[model samples]
Target chain A: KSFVVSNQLREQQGELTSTWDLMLQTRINLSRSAVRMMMDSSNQQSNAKVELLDSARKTLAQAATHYKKFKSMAPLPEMVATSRNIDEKYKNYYTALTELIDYLDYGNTGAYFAQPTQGMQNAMGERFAQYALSSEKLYRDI
Target chain B: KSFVVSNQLREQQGELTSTWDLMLQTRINLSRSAVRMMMDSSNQQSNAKVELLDSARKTLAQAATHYKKFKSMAPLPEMVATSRNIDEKYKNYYTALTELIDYLDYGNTGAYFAQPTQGMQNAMGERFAQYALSSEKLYRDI
Candidate 1:
Protein backbone atom coordinates (compact mmCIF):
# COMPACT_ATOMS: atom_id res chain seq x y z
CA LYS A 1 0.00 0.00 0.00
CA SER A 2 2.79 2.45 0.87
CA PHE A 3 4.64 1.74 -2.38
CA VAL A 4 1.45 2.11 -4.39
CA VAL A 5 0.66 5.46 -2.80
CA SER A 6 4.19 6.73 -3.38
CA ASN A 7 4.12 5.71 -7.01
CA GLN A 8 0.76 7.41 -7.50
CA LEU A 9 2.11 10.63 -6.01
CA ARG A 10 5.13 10.49 -8.27
CA GLU A 11 2.90 9.95 -11.27
CA GLN A 12 0.81 12.92 -10.33
CA GLN A 13 3.88 15.06 -9.99
CA GLY A 14 5.12 13.94 -13.37
CA GLU A 15 1.77 14.77 -14.94
CA LEU A 16 1.82 18.22 -13.40
CA THR A 17 5.32 18.83 -14.68
CA SER A 18 4.31 17.70 -18.15
CA THR A 19 1.36 20.04 -18.05
CA TRP A 20 3.63 22.92 -17.11
CA ASP A 21 5.90 22.15 -20.03
CA LEU A 22 2.94 22.17 -22.38
CA MET A 23 1.74 25.46 -20.98
CA LEU A 24 5.19 26.96 -21.53
CA GLN A 25 5.20 25.80 -25.13
CA THR A 26 1.72 27.22 -25.69
CA ARG A 27 2.65 30.55 -24.18
CA ILE A 28 5.68 30.80 -26.41
CA ASN A 29 3.56 30.14 -29.46
CA LEU A 30 0.90 32.62 -28.36
CA SER A 31 3.41 35.37 -27.65
CA ARG A 32 5.12 34.88 -30.98
CA SER A 33 1.77 34.96 -32.75
CA ALA A 34 0.78 38.11 -30.90
CA VAL A 35 4.03 39.87 -31.79
CA ARG A 36 3.66 38.89 -35.41
CA MET A 37 0.07 40.13 -35.69
CA MET A 38 0.82 43.47 -34.06
CA MET A 39 3.57 44.11 -36.58
CA ASP A 40 1.20 43.33 -39.46
CA SER A 41 -1.65 45.56 -38.25
CA SER A 42 0.48 48.69 -37.83
CA ASN A 43 0.76 49.64 -41.48
CA GLN A 44 -2.65 50.05 -43.17
CA GLN A 45 -5.04 52.92 -42.58
CA SER A 46 -8.78 52.14 -42.48
CA ASN A 47 -8.83 48.33 -42.28
CA ALA A 48 -5.56 48.02 -40.37
CA LYS A 49 -7.29 47.97 -37.02
CA VAL A 50 -9.58 45.14 -38.04
CA GLU A 51 -6.74 42.92 -39.10
CA LEU A 52 -4.79 43.53 -35.91
CA LEU A 53 -7.79 42.87 -33.72
CA ASP A 54 -8.44 39.65 -35.63
CA SER A 55 -4.90 38.49 -35.06
CA ALA A 56 -5.08 39.11 -31.34
CA ARG A 57 -8.34 37.19 -31.16
CA LYS A 58 -6.69 34.22 -32.86
CA THR A 59 -3.65 34.25 -30.56
CA LEU A 60 -5.86 34.24 -27.49
CA ALA A 61 -7.71 31.21 -28.82
CA GLN A 62 -4.47 29.26 -29.12
CA ALA A 63 -3.46 30.23 -25.61
CA ALA A 64 -6.87 29.26 -24.31
CA THR A 65 -6.70 25.83 -25.87
CA HIS A 66 -3.40 25.05 -24.24
CA TYR A 67 -4.52 26.56 -20.98
CA LYS A 68 -7.72 24.55 -20.91
CA LYS A 69 -5.99 21.38 -21.91
CA PHE A 70 -3.55 21.74 -19.08
CA LYS A 71 -6.20 22.71 -16.59
CA SER A 72 -8.42 19.79 -17.47
CA MET A 73 -5.64 17.28 -17.26
CA ALA A 74 -3.99 18.48 -14.06
CA PRO A 75 -3.88 21.50 -11.81
CA LEU A 76 -0.67 23.52 -12.11
CA PRO A 77 0.80 26.67 -10.56
CA GLU A 78 2.70 27.98 -13.59
CA MET A 79 -0.65 28.42 -15.31
CA VAL A 80 -1.44 31.37 -13.12
CA ALA A 81 1.77 33.06 -14.21
CA THR A 82 1.18 32.06 -17.82
CA SER A 83 -2.38 33.34 -17.76
CA ARG A 84 -1.35 36.63 -16.19
CA ASN A 85 1.40 37.16 -18.75
CA ILE A 86 -0.93 36.33 -21.61
CA ASP A 87 -3.53 38.72 -20.25
CA GLU A 88 -0.95 41.47 -19.86
CA LYS A 89 0.32 40.99 -23.40
CA TYR A 90 -3.19 41.23 -24.83
CA LYS A 91 -3.84 44.26 -22.70
CA ASN A 92 -0.79 46.07 -23.99
CA TYR A 93 -1.46 45.26 -27.64
CA TYR A 94 -5.16 46.13 -27.53
CA THR A 95 -4.53 49.37 -25.68
CA ALA A 96 -2.16 50.59 -28.38
CA LEU A 97 -4.48 49.53 -31.20
CA THR A 98 -7.63 51.08 -29.69
CA GLU A 99 -6.03 54.46 -29.13
CA LEU A 100 -5.13 54.57 -32.79
CA ILE A 101 -8.78 53.95 -33.57
CA ASP A 102 -9.86 56.68 -31.20
CA TYR A 103 -7.62 59.21 -32.89
CA LEU A 104 -9.04 58.25 -36.26
CA ASP A 105 -12.57 58.57 -34.97
CA TYR A 106 -12.09 61.84 -33.12
CA GLY A 107 -9.30 63.33 -35.26
CA ASN A 108 -7.06 65.36 -32.88
CA THR A 109 -9.78 67.80 -31.80
CA GLY A 110 -10.01 67.04 -28.09
CA ALA A 111 -8.23 69.03 -25.41
CA TYR A 112 -5.45 66.51 -25.47
CA PHE A 113 -5.11 66.77 -29.23
CA ALA A 114 -5.57 70.55 -29.24
CA GLN A 115 -2.44 71.51 -27.31
CA PRO A 116 -0.14 68.53 -27.00
CA THR A 117 -1.66 67.00 -23.89
CA GLN A 118 1.34 65.52 -22.18
CA GLY A 119 -0.61 63.32 -19.80
CA MET A 120 -2.46 61.27 -22.38
CA GLN A 121 0.41 60.77 -24.75
CA ASN A 122 2.91 59.92 -22.06
CA ALA A 123 0.55 57.34 -20.67
CA MET A 124 0.19 55.83 -24.09
CA GLY A 125 3.93 55.63 -24.57
CA GLU A 126 4.48 54.08 -21.17
CA ARG A 127 1.99 51.31 -21.79
CA PHE A 128 3.52 50.50 -25.14
CA ALA A 129 6.97 50.36 -23.61
CA GLN A 130 5.75 48.17 -20.82
CA TYR A 131 3.98 45.93 -23.26
CA ALA A 132 7.12 45.46 -25.30
CA LEU A 133 9.02 44.63 -22.18
CA SER A 134 6.38 42.25 -20.91
CA SER A 135 6.21 40.39 -24.19
CA GLU A 136 9.93 40.01 -24.20
CA LYS A 137 9.95 38.80 -20.63
CA LEU A 138 7.15 36.31 -21.14
CA TYR A 139 8.67 35.00 -24.33
CA ARG A 140 12.01 34.50 -22.65
CA ASP A 141 10.50 33.03 -19.51
CA ILE A 142 8.51 30.50 -21.45
CA LYS B 1 -24.71 2.19 -30.31
CA SER B 2 -26.47 5.48 -30.85
CA PHE B 3 -26.85 5.99 -27.13
CA VAL B 4 -23.17 5.28 -26.52
CA VAL B 5 -22.09 7.61 -29.29
CA SER B 6 -24.44 10.30 -28.07
CA ASN B 7 -23.03 9.96 -24.56
CA GLN B 8 -19.48 10.32 -25.85
CA LEU B 9 -20.43 13.33 -27.92
CA ARG B 10 -22.12 14.89 -24.96
CA GLU B 11 -19.05 14.39 -22.85
CA GLN B 12 -16.82 16.08 -25.42
CA GLN B 13 -19.31 18.89 -25.84
CA GLY B 14 -19.46 19.42 -22.15
CA GLU B 15 -15.70 19.55 -22.00
CA LEU B 16 -15.50 22.04 -24.81
CA THR B 17 -18.21 24.20 -23.29
CA SER B 18 -16.52 24.23 -19.94
CA THR B 19 -13.21 25.16 -21.52
CA TRP B 20 -14.74 27.94 -23.56
CA ASP B 21 -16.53 29.32 -20.53
CA LEU B 22 -13.29 29.47 -18.61
CA MET B 23 -11.59 31.24 -21.51
CA LEU B 24 -14.36 33.84 -21.55
CA GLN B 25 -14.00 34.48 -17.87
CA THR B 26 -10.23 34.81 -18.23
CA ARG B 27 -10.71 37.28 -21.07
CA ILE B 28 -12.94 39.47 -18.94
CA ASN B 29 -10.62 39.34 -15.98
CA LEU B 30 -7.50 40.08 -18.04
CA SER B 31 -9.08 43.01 -19.82
CA ARG B 32 -10.11 44.56 -16.53
CA SER B 33 -6.69 44.08 -15.08
CA ALA B 34 -4.94 45.60 -18.12
CA VAL B 35 -7.22 48.63 -18.16
CA ARG B 36 -6.72 49.28 -14.49
CA MET B 37 -3.00 48.95 -14.86
CA MET B 38 -2.96 51.42 -17.73
CA MET B 39 -5.01 53.94 -15.77
CA ASP B 40 -2.70 53.68 -12.81
CA SER B 41 0.36 53.91 -14.98
CA SER B 42 -1.01 56.98 -16.72
CA ASN B 43 -1.67 58.75 -13.46
CA GLN B 44 1.98 58.38 -12.56
CA GLN B 45 3.21 59.91 -15.80
CA SER B 46 3.22 63.70 -16.20
CA ASN B 47 3.50 63.57 -20.00
CA ALA B 48 0.51 63.96 -22.33
CA LYS B 49 1.82 61.42 -24.78
CA VAL B 50 2.25 58.88 -22.03
CA GLU B 51 -1.23 59.50 -20.70
CA LEU B 52 -2.79 59.18 -24.16
CA LEU B 53 -0.90 55.98 -24.81
CA ASP B 54 -2.12 54.58 -21.52
CA SER B 55 -5.71 55.52 -22.31
CA ALA B 56 -5.38 53.87 -25.69
CA ARG B 57 -3.96 50.79 -24.05
CA LYS B 58 -6.81 50.59 -21.58
CA THR B 59 -9.52 51.01 -24.20
CA LEU B 60 -7.90 48.52 -26.55
CA ALA B 61 -7.69 45.91 -23.81
CA GLN B 62 -11.38 46.34 -23.06
CA ALA B 63 -12.44 45.99 -26.69
CA ALA B 64 -10.00 43.20 -27.54
CA THR B 65 -11.11 40.96 -24.69
CA HIS B 66 -14.67 40.94 -25.92
CA TYR B 67 -13.52 40.15 -29.45
CA LYS B 68 -11.21 37.43 -28.18
CA LYS B 69 -13.95 35.70 -26.21
CA PHE B 70 -16.60 36.05 -28.89
CA LYS B 71 -14.35 34.66 -31.59
CA SER B 72 -13.30 31.78 -29.40
CA MET B 73 -16.88 30.56 -29.22
CA ALA B 74 -17.97 31.32 -32.77
CA PRO B 75 -18.53 27.73 -33.86
CA LEU B 76 -22.04 27.79 -32.46
CA PRO B 77 -23.11 30.31 -35.17
CA GLU B 78 -25.38 31.81 -32.55
CA MET B 79 -22.33 33.63 -31.29
CA VAL B 80 -21.12 34.76 -34.72
CA ALA B 81 -22.90 38.10 -34.62
CA THR B 82 -21.60 38.83 -31.17
CA SER B 83 -18.10 37.92 -32.30
CA ARG B 84 -18.34 40.19 -35.34
CA ASN B 85 -19.61 43.05 -33.24
CA ILE B 86 -16.86 42.58 -30.72
CA ASP B 87 -14.31 42.43 -33.50
CA GLU B 88 -15.56 45.73 -34.89
CA LYS B 89 -15.47 47.32 -31.50
CA TYR B 90 -11.92 46.19 -30.90
CA LYS B 91 -10.86 47.10 -34.41
CA ASN B 92 -11.98 50.62 -33.78
CA TYR B 93 -10.35 50.52 -30.41
CA TYR B 94 -7.10 49.27 -31.95
CA THR B 95 -6.99 52.16 -34.40
CA ALA B 96 -7.51 54.70 -31.64
CA LEU B 97 -4.87 53.10 -29.46
CA THR B 98 -2.34 52.91 -32.25
CA GLU B 99 -2.62 56.55 -33.19
CA LEU B 100 -2.33 57.63 -29.58
CA ILE B 101 0.70 55.48 -28.97
CA ASP B 102 2.30 56.55 -32.20
CA TYR B 103 1.78 60.22 -31.55
CA LEU B 104 3.18 59.93 -28.08
CA ASP B 105 6.10 57.85 -29.18
CA TYR B 106 6.76 59.69 -32.40
CA GLY B 107 5.44 63.21 -33.25
CA ASN B 108 6.34 64.65 -29.86
CA THR B 109 10.02 65.26 -29.09
CA GLY B 110 9.71 66.97 -25.70
CA ALA B 111 7.54 64.23 -24.25
CA TYR B 112 10.08 61.55 -24.96
CA PHE B 113 11.87 59.69 -22.24
CA ALA B 114 12.43 56.69 -24.47
CA GLN B 115 9.04 56.60 -26.15
CA PRO B 116 8.18 54.02 -28.82
CA THR B 117 8.63 54.87 -32.49
CA GLN B 118 5.68 54.91 -34.87
CA GLY B 119 6.97 52.00 -36.88
CA MET B 120 7.76 49.83 -33.87
CA GLN B 121 4.46 50.59 -32.15
CA ASN B 122 2.43 49.87 -35.27
CA ALA B 123 4.43 46.81 -36.10
CA MET B 124 3.95 45.25 -32.68
CA GLY B 125 0.32 46.30 -32.51
CA GLU B 126 -0.59 44.78 -35.85
CA ARG B 127 1.14 41.49 -35.05
CA PHE B 128 -0.70 40.92 -31.76
CA ALA B 129 -4.09 41.99 -33.05
CA GLN B 130 -3.99 39.68 -36.06
CA TYR B 131 -2.86 36.63 -34.11
CA ALA B 132 -5.55 37.07 -31.49
CA LEU B 133 -8.36 37.51 -33.99
CA SER B 134 -7.28 34.80 -36.42
CA SER B 135 -6.64 32.23 -33.72
CA GLU B 136 -10.05 32.82 -32.22
CA LYS B 137 -11.82 32.60 -35.56
CA LEU B 138 -10.04 29.40 -36.45
CA TYR B 139 -11.02 27.69 -33.23
CA ARG B 140 -14.62 28.83 -33.37
CA ASP B 141 -15.03 27.73 -36.96
CA ILE B 142 -13.43 24.41 -36.17
Candidate 2:
Protein backbone atom coordinates (compact mmCIF):
# COMPACT_ATOMS: atom_id res chain seq x y z
CA LYS A 1 0.00 0.00 0.00
CA SER A 2 3.03 2.28 0.35
CA PHE A 3 3.45 2.52 -3.39
CA VAL A 4 -0.30 2.70 -3.81
CA VAL A 5 -0.60 6.51 -3.84
CA SER A 6 2.26 7.23 -6.23
CA ASN A 7 1.24 4.40 -8.51
CA GLN A 8 -2.30 5.68 -8.65
CA LEU A 9 -1.28 9.26 -9.42
CA ARG A 10 0.88 8.17 -12.36
CA GLU A 11 -1.76 5.95 -13.88
CA GLN A 12 -4.31 8.74 -13.59
CA GLN A 13 -1.88 11.01 -15.44
CA GLY A 14 -1.47 8.52 -18.30
CA GLU A 15 -5.18 7.99 -18.63
CA LEU A 16 -5.49 11.75 -18.47
CA THR A 17 -3.07 12.32 -21.37
CA SER A 18 -4.80 9.88 -23.71
CA THR A 19 -8.15 11.59 -23.26
CA TRP A 20 -6.57 15.04 -23.53
CA ASP A 21 -5.50 14.27 -27.08
CA LEU A 22 -9.00 13.26 -28.03
CA MET A 23 -10.49 16.43 -26.43
CA LEU A 24 -8.08 18.66 -28.39
CA GLN A 25 -9.19 17.21 -31.72
CA THR A 26 -12.83 17.46 -30.76
CA ARG A 27 -12.48 21.11 -29.68
CA ILE A 28 -10.88 22.05 -32.98
CA ASN A 29 -13.79 20.48 -34.83
CA LEU A 30 -16.34 22.19 -32.59
CA SER A 31 -14.71 25.59 -32.99
CA ARG A 32 -14.54 25.23 -36.75
CA SER A 33 -18.23 24.40 -36.80
CA ALA A 34 -19.08 27.50 -34.77
CA VAL A 35 -16.82 29.59 -36.94
CA ARG A 36 -18.61 28.19 -39.96
CA MET A 37 -22.01 28.95 -38.48
CA MET A 38 -20.91 32.44 -37.50
CA MET A 39 -19.81 33.19 -41.06
CA ASP A 40 -23.13 31.99 -42.47
CA SER A 41 -25.45 34.85 -43.32
CA SER A 42 -28.68 33.01 -42.65
CA ASN A 43 -27.97 32.09 -39.03
CA GLN A 44 -28.55 35.58 -37.69
CA GLN A 45 -30.38 34.05 -34.73
CA SER A 46 -27.15 32.46 -33.62
CA ASN A 47 -25.20 35.69 -33.84
CA ALA A 48 -25.52 36.67 -30.19
CA LYS A 49 -23.96 33.38 -29.11
CA VAL A 50 -21.51 33.06 -31.97
CA GLU A 51 -18.78 35.15 -30.46
CA LEU A 52 -18.32 33.04 -27.32
CA LEU A 53 -18.25 29.97 -29.47
CA ASP A 54 -15.79 31.57 -31.82
CA SER A 55 -13.54 32.76 -29.00
CA ALA A 56 -13.62 29.38 -27.28
CA ARG A 57 -12.82 27.62 -30.50
CA LYS A 58 -9.96 29.94 -31.35
CA THR A 59 -8.51 29.88 -27.87
CA LEU A 60 -8.64 26.11 -27.54
CA ALA A 61 -7.31 25.46 -31.03
CA GLN A 62 -4.39 27.83 -30.62
CA ALA A 63 -3.44 26.31 -27.29
CA ALA A 64 -3.65 22.80 -28.66
CA THR A 65 -1.65 23.67 -31.73
CA HIS A 66 1.07 25.26 -29.68
CA TYR A 67 1.30 22.27 -27.34
CA LYS A 68 1.37 19.87 -30.25
CA LYS A 69 4.15 21.83 -31.91
CA PHE A 70 6.10 21.94 -28.68
CA LYS A 71 5.82 18.21 -28.21
CA SER A 72 6.95 17.56 -31.76
CA MET A 73 10.36 18.98 -30.95
CA ALA A 74 10.93 16.96 -27.79
CA PRO A 75 14.16 14.92 -27.71
CA LEU A 76 12.80 11.60 -26.45
CA PRO A 77 9.92 9.27 -27.21
CA GLU A 78 8.75 9.50 -23.60
CA MET A 79 8.74 13.26 -23.92
CA VAL A 80 6.55 12.87 -26.94
CA ALA A 81 4.33 10.53 -24.98
CA THR A 82 4.15 12.99 -22.12
CA SER A 83 3.24 15.70 -24.56
CA ARG A 84 0.69 13.43 -26.21
CA ASN A 85 -0.88 12.66 -22.85
CA ILE A 86 -1.44 16.35 -22.21
CA ASP A 87 -2.63 16.91 -25.73
CA GLU A 88 -5.08 14.03 -25.61
CA LYS A 89 -6.72 15.18 -22.38
CA TYR A 90 -7.15 18.71 -23.68
CA LYS A 91 -8.56 17.31 -26.89
CA ASN A 92 -11.23 15.38 -25.02
CA TYR A 93 -11.95 18.37 -22.85
CA TYR A 94 -12.44 20.62 -25.84
CA THR A 95 -14.55 17.89 -27.38
CA ALA A 96 -16.86 18.00 -24.39
CA LEU A 97 -16.96 21.76 -24.58
CA THR A 98 -17.92 21.41 -28.22
CA GLU A 99 -20.81 19.26 -27.10
CA LEU A 100 -21.65 21.83 -24.48
CA ILE A 101 -21.64 24.45 -27.24
CA ASP A 102 -24.41 22.64 -29.01
CA TYR A 103 -26.32 22.52 -25.81
CA LEU A 104 -25.77 26.19 -25.19
CA ASP A 105 -26.39 27.18 -28.80
CA TYR A 106 -29.82 25.73 -29.44
CA GLY A 107 -30.82 24.36 -26.07
CA ASN A 108 -32.31 26.43 -23.28
CA THR A 109 -29.68 28.85 -22.03
CA GLY A 110 -30.33 27.88 -18.41
CA ALA A 111 -30.38 24.20 -19.28
CA TYR A 112 -27.17 24.69 -21.24
CA PHE A 113 -25.37 25.06 -17.96
CA ALA A 114 -23.28 22.14 -16.76
CA GLN A 115 -24.94 19.58 -14.54
CA PRO A 116 -23.99 20.23 -10.97
CA THR A 117 -23.70 16.54 -10.19
CA GLN A 118 -21.46 15.76 -13.11
CA GLY A 119 -18.08 16.19 -11.45
CA MET A 120 -15.99 15.44 -14.50
CA GLN A 121 -17.73 17.97 -16.69
CA ASN A 122 -17.26 20.70 -14.16
CA ALA A 123 -13.65 19.66 -13.58
CA MET A 124 -12.68 19.63 -17.24
CA GLY A 125 -14.25 22.99 -18.03
CA GLU A 126 -12.23 24.62 -15.28
CA ARG A 127 -8.97 23.13 -16.52
CA PHE A 128 -9.44 24.19 -20.13
CA ALA A 129 -10.17 27.75 -19.10
CA GLN A 130 -7.07 27.81 -16.97
CA TYR A 131 -5.00 26.37 -19.77
CA ALA A 132 -6.14 29.19 -22.01
CA LEU A 133 -5.37 31.81 -19.41
CA SER A 134 -1.99 30.31 -18.65
CA SER A 135 -1.02 30.16 -22.31
CA GLU A 136 -1.93 33.79 -22.69
CA LYS A 137 0.14 34.73 -19.67
CA LEU A 138 3.02 32.59 -20.82
CA TYR A 139 3.01 34.30 -24.20
CA ARG A 140 2.76 37.73 -22.67
CA ASP A 141 5.43 36.98 -20.09
CA ILE A 142 7.83 35.53 -22.62
CA LYS B 1 10.86 9.40 -18.64
CA SER B 2 10.00 5.83 -19.61
CA PHE B 3 9.70 4.95 -15.97
CA VAL B 4 7.40 7.89 -15.53
CA VAL B 5 4.74 6.32 -17.73
CA SER B 6 4.63 3.02 -15.86
CA ASN B 7 4.90 4.75 -12.53
CA GLN B 8 2.14 7.09 -13.57
CA LEU B 9 -0.13 4.24 -14.53
CA ARG B 10 0.48 2.57 -11.23
CA GLU B 11 -0.30 5.78 -9.41
CA GLN B 12 -3.44 6.16 -11.50
CA GLN B 13 -4.92 2.94 -10.16
CA GLY B 14 -4.55 4.19 -6.65
CA GLU B 15 -6.09 7.52 -7.56
CA LEU B 16 -8.88 5.59 -9.18
CA THR B 17 -9.32 3.63 -5.99
CA SER B 18 -9.49 6.89 -4.07
CA THR B 19 -11.92 8.32 -6.55
CA TRP B 20 -14.15 5.31 -6.21
CA ASP B 21 -13.98 5.53 -2.47
CA LEU B 22 -15.00 9.16 -2.44
CA MET B 23 -17.74 8.45 -4.92
CA LEU B 24 -18.95 5.64 -2.78
CA GLN B 25 -19.10 7.82 0.29
CA THR B 26 -20.82 10.59 -1.56
CA ARG B 27 -23.41 8.17 -2.91
CA ILE B 28 -24.09 6.78 0.51
CA ASN B 29 -24.62 10.30 1.75
CA LEU B 30 -26.88 11.03 -1.19
CA SER B 31 -28.98 7.96 -0.48
CA ARG B 32 -29.50 8.94 3.11
CA SER B 33 -30.31 12.48 2.06
CA ALA B 34 -32.80 11.19 -0.46
CA VAL B 35 -34.65 9.27 2.22
CA ARG B 36 -34.55 12.18 4.56
CA MET B 37 -35.77 14.54 1.92
CA MET B 38 -38.62 12.25 1.09
CA MET B 39 -39.79 12.56 4.67
CA ASP B 40 -39.54 16.34 4.72
CA SER B 41 -42.66 18.12 3.51
CA SER B 42 -40.77 20.96 1.82
CA ASN B 43 -38.77 18.64 -0.44
CA GLN B 44 -41.90 17.28 -2.12
CA GLN B 45 -41.48 19.60 -5.09
CA SER B 46 -38.44 17.77 -6.43
CA ASN B 47 -38.60 14.33 -4.90
CA ALA B 48 -38.25 12.72 -8.28
CA LYS B 49 -35.04 14.57 -8.82
CA VAL B 50 -33.73 13.25 -5.56
CA GLU B 51 -34.70 9.73 -6.56
CA LEU B 52 -32.84 10.04 -9.81
CA LEU B 53 -29.85 11.32 -7.95
CA ASP B 54 -30.07 8.39 -5.57
CA SER B 55 -30.14 5.88 -8.39
CA ALA B 56 -27.13 7.33 -10.14
CA ARG B 57 -25.38 7.63 -6.84
CA LYS B 58 -25.99 4.00 -5.98
CA THR B 59 -24.83 2.65 -9.31
CA LEU B 60 -21.59 4.55 -9.10
CA ALA B 61 -21.11 3.63 -5.48
CA GLN B 62 -21.54 -0.03 -6.22
CA ALA B 63 -18.91 0.23 -8.92
CA ALA B 64 -16.47 1.93 -6.61
CA THR B 65 -17.05 -0.56 -3.83
CA HIS B 66 -16.23 -3.49 -6.06
CA TYR B 67 -13.05 -1.92 -7.34
CA LYS B 68 -11.80 -1.32 -3.84
CA LYS B 69 -12.36 -4.92 -2.88
CA PHE B 70 -10.51 -6.53 -5.79
CA LYS B 71 -9.16 -9.85 -4.62
CA SER B 72 -6.65 -10.43 -7.37
CA MET B 73 -5.34 -7.21 -8.74
CA ALA B 74 -3.40 -7.46 -11.97
CA PRO B 75 -1.04 -5.20 -13.91
CA LEU B 76 1.79 -5.28 -11.42
CA PRO B 77 3.73 -2.11 -10.61
CA GLU B 78 6.74 -2.88 -12.80
CA MET B 79 4.52 -3.54 -15.77
CA VAL B 80 2.74 -0.28 -15.20
CA ALA B 81 6.08 1.52 -15.02
CA THR B 82 7.21 -0.19 -18.21
CA SER B 83 4.02 0.72 -19.99
CA ARG B 84 4.36 4.37 -19.00
CA ASN B 85 7.95 4.41 -20.27
CA ILE B 86 6.96 2.80 -23.55
CA ASP B 87 4.12 5.27 -24.06
CA GLU B 88 6.34 8.29 -23.26
CA LYS B 89 4.09 11.28 -23.75
CA TYR B 90 2.83 13.44 -20.93
CA LYS B 91 0.01 15.91 -20.93
CA ASN B 92 -1.12 18.08 -18.05
CA TYR B 93 -4.67 16.79 -18.25
CA TYR B 94 -5.64 17.42 -14.63
CA THR B 95 -6.36 21.03 -15.57
CA ALA B 96 -9.15 20.11 -17.97
CA LEU B 97 -11.47 18.60 -15.42
CA THR B 98 -10.41 21.17 -12.89
CA GLU B 99 -11.74 23.94 -15.08
CA LEU B 100 -14.80 21.97 -16.07
CA ILE B 101 -16.01 21.66 -12.50
CA ASP B 102 -15.17 25.23 -11.71
CA TYR B 103 -17.30 26.42 -14.60
CA LEU B 104 -20.29 24.38 -13.50
CA ASP B 105 -19.98 25.14 -9.81
CA TYR B 106 -19.62 28.86 -10.29
CA GLY B 107 -15.98 28.40 -9.39
CA ASN B 108 -16.76 26.92 -6.00
CA THR B 109 -15.88 23.35 -6.93
CA GLY B 110 -12.55 22.16 -5.58
CA ALA B 111 -9.43 20.91 -7.36
CA TYR B 112 -10.72 17.41 -7.99
CA PHE B 113 -12.85 18.64 -10.86
CA ALA B 114 -9.93 20.72 -12.08
CA GLN B 115 -8.56 17.98 -14.34
CA PRO B 116 -7.44 19.71 -17.56
CA THR B 117 -9.90 18.34 -20.09
CA GLN B 118 -12.90 16.22 -20.95
CA GLY B 119 -10.61 13.58 -22.42
CA MET B 120 -9.18 12.88 -19.01
CA GLN B 121 -12.68 12.87 -17.63
CA ASN B 122 -13.91 10.32 -20.19
CA ALA B 123 -10.75 8.28 -20.13
CA MET B 124 -10.61 8.07 -16.34
CA GLY B 125 -14.36 7.68 -16.14
CA GLU B 126 -14.27 4.82 -18.63
CA ARG B 127 -11.38 3.11 -16.91
CA PHE B 128 -12.99 3.44 -13.51
CA ALA B 129 -16.34 2.33 -14.85
CA GLN B 130 -14.72 -0.64 -16.49
CA TYR B 131 -12.74 -1.46 -13.41
CA ALA B 132 -15.93 -1.39 -11.38
CA LEU B 133 -17.82 -3.56 -13.86
CA SER B 134 -14.94 -6.01 -14.21
CA SER B 135 -14.54 -6.33 -10.49
CA GLU B 136 -18.27 -6.82 -10.05
CA LYS B 137 -18.30 -9.52 -12.71
CA LEU B 138 -15.32 -11.26 -11.25
CA TYR B 139 -16.84 -11.27 -7.81
CA ARG B 140 -20.14 -12.56 -9.08
CA ASP B 141 -18.51 -15.22 -11.20
CA ILE B 142 -16.65 -16.61 -8.26
Q: Any idea how many clashes model 1 has? A: 77
**Against the correct fold, how does model 2 do in TM-score?**
0.26
lDDT values of the candidates? 0.35, 0.39
Q: A107 in model 2: Cα distance from truth in Å?
A: 3.8
Pairing residues by index, what is the TM-score of model 1?
0.23
Candidate 1: tens digits of C-alpha lDDT, residues B1-142: 4333322322322232222222322222222222223233354322333443454455455445544543444333333444354345445434534444454444442222123333343343343334334433433333
> Any runs in candidate 1 off by more than 4 Å, and if so which?
A1-44, A76-142, B1-48, B51-142
Candidate 2: tens digits of C-alpha lDDT, residues B35-126: 33323456443245345344545545554454444322444443443324312211122334223323333322223223334345345445
Q: Per-residue lDDT of A34-112 in model 2, one digit per residue for the tens?
A: 3334234564433534654555555555555544544444323223443444455555555656555665466333332
When candidate 1 is compared with the true two-chain complex, its DockQ is 0.03
